[PDB]
Amino acid sequence: PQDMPPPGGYEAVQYKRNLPSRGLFRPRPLLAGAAVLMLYGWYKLVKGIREQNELAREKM
Amino acid sequence: KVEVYERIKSLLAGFDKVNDPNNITETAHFANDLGLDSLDTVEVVMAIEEEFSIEIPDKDADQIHSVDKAIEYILRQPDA
Amino acid sequence: VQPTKFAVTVRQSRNWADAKQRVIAAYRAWIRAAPEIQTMYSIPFPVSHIRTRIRQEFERHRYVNKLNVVDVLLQQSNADFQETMNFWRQQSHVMAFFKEEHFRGEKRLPSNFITGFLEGRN
Amino acid sequence: KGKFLVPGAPTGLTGLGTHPSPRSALLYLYHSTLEKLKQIPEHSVYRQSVEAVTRHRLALVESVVPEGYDAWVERAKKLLEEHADQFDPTKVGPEGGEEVQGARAVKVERDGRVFVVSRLPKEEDERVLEWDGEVDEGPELEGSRTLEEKIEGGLEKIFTRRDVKDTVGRVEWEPEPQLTAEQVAELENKIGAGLIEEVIQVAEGELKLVDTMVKARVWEPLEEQPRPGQWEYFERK
Amino acid sequence: VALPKDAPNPRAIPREPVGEIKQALVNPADKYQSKADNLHKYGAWLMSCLPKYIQQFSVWKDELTIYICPTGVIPVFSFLKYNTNAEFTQVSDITAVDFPTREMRFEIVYNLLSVRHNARIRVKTYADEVTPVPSITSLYMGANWYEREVYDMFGVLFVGHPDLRRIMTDYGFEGHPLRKDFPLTGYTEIRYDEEKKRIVVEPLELTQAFRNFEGGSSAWDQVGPGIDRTPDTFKLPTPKPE
Amino acid sequence: SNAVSITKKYTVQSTGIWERIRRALVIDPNRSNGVPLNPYNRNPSPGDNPPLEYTDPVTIPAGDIADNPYWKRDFRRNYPRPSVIAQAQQVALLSVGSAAQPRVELIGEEGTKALVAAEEEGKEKGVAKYLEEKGAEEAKRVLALTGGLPPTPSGQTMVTGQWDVHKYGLAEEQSYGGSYPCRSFV
Amino acid sequence: ATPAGPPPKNFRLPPPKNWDEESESTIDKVGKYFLMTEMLRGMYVLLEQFFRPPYTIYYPFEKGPISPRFRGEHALRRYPSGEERCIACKLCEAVCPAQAITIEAEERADGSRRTTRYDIDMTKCIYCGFCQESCPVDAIVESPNAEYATETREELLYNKEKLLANGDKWEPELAAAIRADAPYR
Numbered sequence A: 001p002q003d004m005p006p007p008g009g010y011e012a013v014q015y016k017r018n019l020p021s022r023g024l025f026r027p028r029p030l031l032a033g034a035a036v037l038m039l040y041g042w043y044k045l046v047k048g049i050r051e052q053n054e055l056a057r058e059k060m
Numbered sequence B: 001k002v003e004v005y006e007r008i009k010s011l012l013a014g015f016d017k018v019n020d021p022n023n024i025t026e027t028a029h030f031a032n033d034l035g036l037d038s039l040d041t042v043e044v045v046m047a048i049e050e051e052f053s054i055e056i057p058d059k060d061a062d063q064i065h066s067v068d069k070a071i072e073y074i075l076r077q078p079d080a
Numbered sequence C: 001v002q003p004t005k006f007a008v009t010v011r012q013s014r015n016w017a018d019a020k021q022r023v024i025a026a027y028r029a030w031i032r033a034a035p036e037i038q039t040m041y042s043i044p045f046p047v048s049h050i051r052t053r054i055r056q057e058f059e060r061h062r063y064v065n066k067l068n069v070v071d072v073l074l075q076q077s078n079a080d081f082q083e084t085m086n087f088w089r090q091q092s093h094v095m096a097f098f099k100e101e102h103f104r105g106e107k108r109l110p111s112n113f114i115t116g117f118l119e120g121r122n
Numbered sequence D: 001k002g003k004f005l006v007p008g009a010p011t012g013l014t015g016l017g018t019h020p021s022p023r024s025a026l027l028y029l030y031h032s033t034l035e036k037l038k039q040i041p042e043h044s045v046y047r048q049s050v051e052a053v054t055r056h057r058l059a060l061v062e063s064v065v066p067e068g069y070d071a072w073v074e075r076a077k078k079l080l081e082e083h084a085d086q087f088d089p090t091k092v093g094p095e096g097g098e099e100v101q102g103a104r105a106v107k108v109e110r111d112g113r114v115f116v117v118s119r120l121p122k123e124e125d126e127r128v129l130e131w132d133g134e135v136d137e138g139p140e141l142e143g144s145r146t147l148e149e150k151i152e153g154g155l156e157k158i159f160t161r162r163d164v165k166d167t168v169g170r171v172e173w174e175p176e177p178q179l180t181a182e183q184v185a186e187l188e189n190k191i192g193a194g195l196i197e198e199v200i201q202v203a204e205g206e207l208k209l210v211d212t213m214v215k216a217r218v219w220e221p222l223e224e225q226p227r228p229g230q231w232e233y234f235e236r237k
Numbered sequence E: 001v002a003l004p005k006d007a008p009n010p011r012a013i014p015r016e017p018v019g020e021i022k023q024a025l026v027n028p029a030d031k032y033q034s035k036a037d038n039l040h041k042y043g044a045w046l047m048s049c050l051p052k053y054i055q056q057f058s059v060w061k062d063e064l065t066i067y068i069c070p071t072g073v074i075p076v077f078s079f080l081k082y083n084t085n086a087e088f089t090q091v092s093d094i095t096a097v098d099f100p101t102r103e104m105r106f107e108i109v110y111n112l113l114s115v116r117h118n119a120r121i122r123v124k125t126y127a128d129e130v131t132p133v134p135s136i137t138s139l140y141m142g143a144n145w146y147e148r149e150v151y152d153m154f155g156v157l158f159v160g161h162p163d164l165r166r167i168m169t170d171y172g173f174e175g176h177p178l179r180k181d182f183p184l185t186g187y188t189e190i191r192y193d194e195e196k197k198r199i200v201v202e203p204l205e206l207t208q209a210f211r212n213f214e215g216g217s218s219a220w221d222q223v224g225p226g227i228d229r230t231p232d233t234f235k236l237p238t239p240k241p242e
Numbered sequence F: 001s002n003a004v005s006i007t008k009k010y011t012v013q014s015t016g017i018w019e020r021i022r023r024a025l026v027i028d029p030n031r032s033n034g035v036p037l038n039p040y041n042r043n044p045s046p047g048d049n050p051p052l053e054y055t056d057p058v059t060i061p062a063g064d065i066a067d068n069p070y071w072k073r074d075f076r077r078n079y080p081r082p083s084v085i086a087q088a089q090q091v092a093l094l095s096v097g098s099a100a101q102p103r104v105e106l107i108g109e110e111g112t113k114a115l116v117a118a119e120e121e122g123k124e125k126g127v128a129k130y131l132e133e134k135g136a137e138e139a140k141r142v143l144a145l146t147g148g149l150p151p152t153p154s155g156q157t158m159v160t161g162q163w164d165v166h167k168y169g170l171a172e173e174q175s176y177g178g179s180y181p182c183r184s185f186v
Numbered sequence G: 001a002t003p004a005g006p007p008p009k010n011f012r013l014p015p016p017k018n019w020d021e022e023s024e025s026t027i028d029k030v031g032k033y034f035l036m037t038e039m040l041r042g043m044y045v046l047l048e049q050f051f052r053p054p055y056t057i058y059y060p061f062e063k064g065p066i067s068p069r070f071r072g073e074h075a076l077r078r079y080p081s082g083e084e085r086c087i088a089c090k091l092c093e094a095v096c097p098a099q100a101i102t103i104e105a106e107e108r109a110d111g112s113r114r115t116t117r118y119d120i121d122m123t124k125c126i127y128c129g130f131c132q133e134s135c136p137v138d139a140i141v142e143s144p145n146a147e148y149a150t151e152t153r154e155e156l157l158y159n160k161e162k163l164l165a166n167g168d169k170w171e172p173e174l175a176a177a178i179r180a181d182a183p184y185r
């Protein structure tokens, strides 16, 4: 015979724009994250430079 | 005015299409006197043009048919 | 010259007084331009040879007594002028207008009967 | 909210923006077209074709009337009558004046009908507008100057122009009421040629063709016959 | 290889056998008779509205052609650009055809499109080696380069055109290649000259001469005369007997 | 959404722990990687497709042995001619009508000489002289052929069965939604 | 610009929305600006490719796929007997789109109709395959060989001694490709 389609036809293929929104790139979870990172870092820095200043008092 | 003749006069002396030198006067006509053709005129005026470092417009170049007309155009141009 | 530097809108000569005015203005521009053509295209000829050769190309059509024939011959000139004054033509096209830069040279037809016979029609 | 079309809002077609007054523009163009058709003889099919089509569209345009139109037109009739010299093309030019920062109108007559062409000063941001938009011709010539130089500098315009705030001898021309956005849609469903703004583009094309159709006298007999064997190709038999 | 597991082999599926295939015979010209009457009507209306220039009109299938005087170019294209029933606002193509057996060698063919009416129209005029044609770049900006091609390839000259220069050929090229007297391989060839250090231009020699197999055209005509297909609305009424 | 499951997409799949890893750290789990399947794609090659399986078909009318004379199906030699009408022809058509619709009965004799009266006037005078001299009354008649308006040109679709413009309308569902400056048209 | 008849239902755009009519929270709008979230998504798609198999083929050890209909360099074939199939009809010379074939024939010593010249300008040929569709004896074919760059273009003037040598070389593969595609020809 010839090259013909299957008896019931081929199934539908995906052709529409899919592009699904992910939480990883939405602004609200990222804004919250960047903020907690800077707040944790600012707590760690405020403790370190206090200790550094006290080490300097002992050195002097 | 004596120079603008002297430089033009020697120029036509070397121009070959001039029928014969010594026919060059203050009022010499390019066609009647010198026997220069319609396209020999343009060649002459171009030599007239370049020697004095000025560009002749078409509206003015069509007027340059006699030597005296050539003189009165070059005097009117401030540069030389 | 709106679209290009040396563009001229295609015009049809109104009469012989007009048609001769345009021819003379065409010849004037070409022989004016000969120094500018000789430096850009590095033509190894005198400006005088260029000008005398420009004259020949107008001397070919001196006996045209048709006004419709002059306008096409004028448009051809204007277009040639535009492509030469803009550096659009290559040195190869320009110095190929001089018919002595063939390795056979200007002498390319046989001179008379006998010399073309001994060479097989040149 | 959406009762009226924003003027100059995009239509969907790029470069074509919503007409400020679509109905009167179309009426002006049709009547102007009908007036130039009298330069053409009656027996030309061109004129009959343009006349019939133009009158057909002119009838449907006039079929819709903006609300308050009868009320507005009565005031506008009087407002023209008592202040005619304010809107006269022979007095204030084809433009309604030279003070482009002020309102400009002119009464124009076409084909037994009266129109006012009002040109409105452009709405610009106050943060960018210098001198309320008064055009800058440059500085005045100062110093020792000649009589001729002062004239070419515009000095005689002192005794002609007016302060834009100077509105005592003048009256404000009030614009015509517009169609609604739904009325415009109904106009479109009658004429059957797409968007109203796109119909004005075609309509002002018919106006320009009459000038070329008269200059060329297209109704005159054939100029150049086909000489024999001109449109003959390669047909057999 | 990890198979998709719910995407089976599309080749493994068996196909329902096709037996006797039957196709009706159609004459593709027959689909165009329903519009044959209006295409004639539109061409008849056009030449009554512009009797000064429209010499004739032809209709082949879906194509209406208008034949015009060369001096009518600006009026005719204006009417076909700015008429409300002739809203032909695109030039699709302008080209020439050469007929050296005619006194006017060149036929100028314009193809126009009306997006408003989903319609096409062809306009034909004529030109010569010296007889110029009006340019229509006053009406269609897109026609500018087309006329440069017709000029470059045929020598036809377009009065009014801004910058009518060559568009296709080389800069010092002499000749018009689409002319039927112009030879296929031209008259000149180029090469690099070592002794001159540039590319030079030479008279044409071909290592193999071009073999033209035109002589093998059938001694017998193979198409015949065709069939007349004019609407009865554009035929002359016949005189009934008695 | 618009996606269909990866399991129906005829690409190589990730398996086991790597499938769980992929379906976690990936934008769209239903997206394929574009790698085709060896047991399915171009398998077998066209060089191993059996020569004897394929059949070159004929259709019954044109390919039969017993009920088709070639000259019924020679549509190349039944090609339409171009139908040409010049200015002389249209003068006659307006003068005396058309085989579809005559202006005069043209019965027997003294109608044949009226049929050249149409043809003779056509050569002598264009459609322009003809319209000038019989007045603007028959300028109205040229439009009376198409109902009093000029005719509009023919469209080129026939999807509705009649030649017409295509009715371009907005599709029911837009592919970008209103979110992008691009509309979809059906 | 739109078709004749009624304008399309809602062809005209809606009126434009002012900035404060837009439906996008300032938090979402400002975050997407400063965090550059859509650019972050695209960089993530390149990480996805990084961990996918490449498409590359190691050539010349692995070759790309070619069909039985492939159009490579020409060959002149024989019969099982050993006689050349070519009988000098010149059909392949008439149909050549680029005039790349030059054939001179005469009567062979035994009276058979055979070519004396058979040249193919491999630098004129467009590899259309027309020459092999027109053959009545399958004499001229195009082998699947695409790897024959040469040094001089004199090597690209195939004469009848090279085209027969090619057919002798490539016959199994030529017979195989013909066997696959003959039903469709």
Ligand SMILES: *P(=O)(O)OCC(C)(C)[C@H](O)C(=O)NCCC(=O)NCCSC(=O)CCCCCCCCCCCCC
Binding pocket: B037, B038, B039, C019, C020, C023, C024, C026, C030, C037, C054, C057, C058, C059, C061, C062, C063, C064, C065, C070, C073, C074, C076, C077, C080, C084, C094, C097
């Ligand atoms: P005088 O009155 O004697 O002559 C004036 C003319 C010549 C106008 C005649 O009176 C006349 O009427 N002759 C017929 C009109 C005529 O000359 N027709 C043609 C004019 S156009 C023409 O001749 C163009 C020539 C070629 C232009 C280009 C020349 C230079 C090209 C190459 C330059 C060098 C390489 C870049």
Ligand code: SF4
Binding pocket: G085, G086, G087, G088, G089, G090, G091, G092, G093, G103, G134, G135, G136, G137, G138, G139, G140
């Ligand atoms: S190869 Fe085939 S087509 Fe060509 S000359 Fe020989 S028999 Fe004829």
Ligand code: SF4
Binding pocket: G092, G095, G096, G097, G098, G099, G100, G101, G120, G124, G125, G126, G127, G128, G129, G130, G131, G132
């Ligand atoms: S494939 Fe080459 S040789 Fe064969 S017909 Fe085509 S161009 Fe000529």
